[PDB]
């Protein structure tokens, strides 16, 4: 709400992720820009440790919902920006049906003029030749609706949603997401009415980038409440 003032132009973004999936340890950095007025994210991500051991599409939801476009008429429901600049902690559990799970903790906050997403990710219980560790995705455009509810006792939000990844054998891999966000600071925040974020992206490669990487263009828009 005064936090929303921090987002009125184009903001630089830095992402840092440390991962361990089934003992396969990796790091990912990301840099780019967000333009919340348009719900627009443009980022490039690099694996800084070598080859990425999981598919990039399974990291996309982990790798800054403060850049959503909230319609004017829904501005009282933007928790994410209201927590800024001190920020929020985002935690998720991602269950890959018939396979392992990711558990994540991200701190999302300003460091000067840069919005930082600092993430820890732990994967356990994966099959070594399942769809994730065996890189069997027909990694495809990922879109869908993030269903948000208020969580009063934690002064934050919860959210849930499903991602369906298409697999080379014609099957789909379900990834069921459960999310909680809690402010880092003590200021009041906006506790929203039930709504969703409509999210879509497109993934590409930088033809000159030798390191394992993902370029991402994403649009995020709050919806569900009419007027």
User: What residue spans define the domains of the chain?
Assistant: 1-227
DSSP assignment of 167-195, as one string?
A: BTTS-EEEEEEEEEEEESSSS--PPPPSE
CATH topology classification for 1-227: Green Fluorescent Protein (2.40.155)
Distance CA 79, CA 35 (A): 17
Q: Report how many helices (DSSP H) and strands (DSSP E) the chain contains, helices first.
A: 1, 11
Experimental technique of record:
X-ray
Residue-wise burial string across 60-97, b where 16 or more C-beta atoms lie within 10 A, e elsewhere: bbbbbbbbbbbbeebeebbbbbbbbbebbbbebebbbe
Residue 43 to residue 218: CA distance in whole angstroms? 9
Length reported for the chain: 227
- DSSP string for 60-89: TTT--GGGPBPPGGGGGG-HHHHTTTT-EE
User: What Å resolution does this PDB entry report?
Assistant: 1.3
Backbone φ and ψ for 37, nearest 5 degrees, come out as -60, -30
Report the distance separating Cα 28 and Cα 48, nearest Å: 6
Q: Give 120's strand partners.
A: 18, 105
- Burial degree of 112 (CB within 10 A; 0-12, 13-18, 19+): exposed
- Tabulate helix, strand, coil % of the chain (nearest 5): 10, 50, 35
């Amino acid at each position: 709400s005064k936090g929303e003032e921090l987002f009125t132009g184009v903001v630089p973004i830095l992402v840092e992720l440390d991962g361990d999936v089934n003992g396969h340890k990796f790091s990912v950095s990301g840099e780019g820009e967000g333009d919340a007025t348009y719900g627009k994210l443009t980022l490039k991500f690099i694996c800084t440790t070598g080859k990425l051991p999981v598919p990039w599409p399974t990291l996309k939801t982990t790798l800054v919902q403060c850049f959503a476009r909230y319609p004017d008429h829904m501005k009282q429901h933007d928790f994410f920006k209201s927590a800024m600049p001190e920020g929020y902690v985002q935690e998720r559990t991602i269950f890959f049906k018939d396979d392992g799970n990711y558990k994540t903790r991200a701190e999302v906050k300003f460091e000067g003029d840069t919005l930082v997403n600092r993430i820890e990710l732990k994967g356990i219980d994966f099959k070594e030749d399942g769809n994730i560790l065996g890189h069997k995705l027909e990694y495809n455009a990922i879109s869908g609706n993030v269903n948000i509810t208020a969580d009063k006792q934690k002064n934050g939000i919860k959210a849930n949603f499903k991602i369906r990844h298409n697999i080379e054998d014609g099957s789909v891999q379900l990834a069921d997401h459960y999310q909680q966000n809690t402010p880092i600071g003590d200021g009041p925040v906006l506790l929203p009415d039930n709504h969703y974020l409509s999210t879509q992206s497109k993934q590409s490669k930088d033809p000159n980038e030798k390191r394992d990487h993902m370029v991402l263009l994403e649009f995020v828009t709050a919806a569900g409440i009419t007027l």
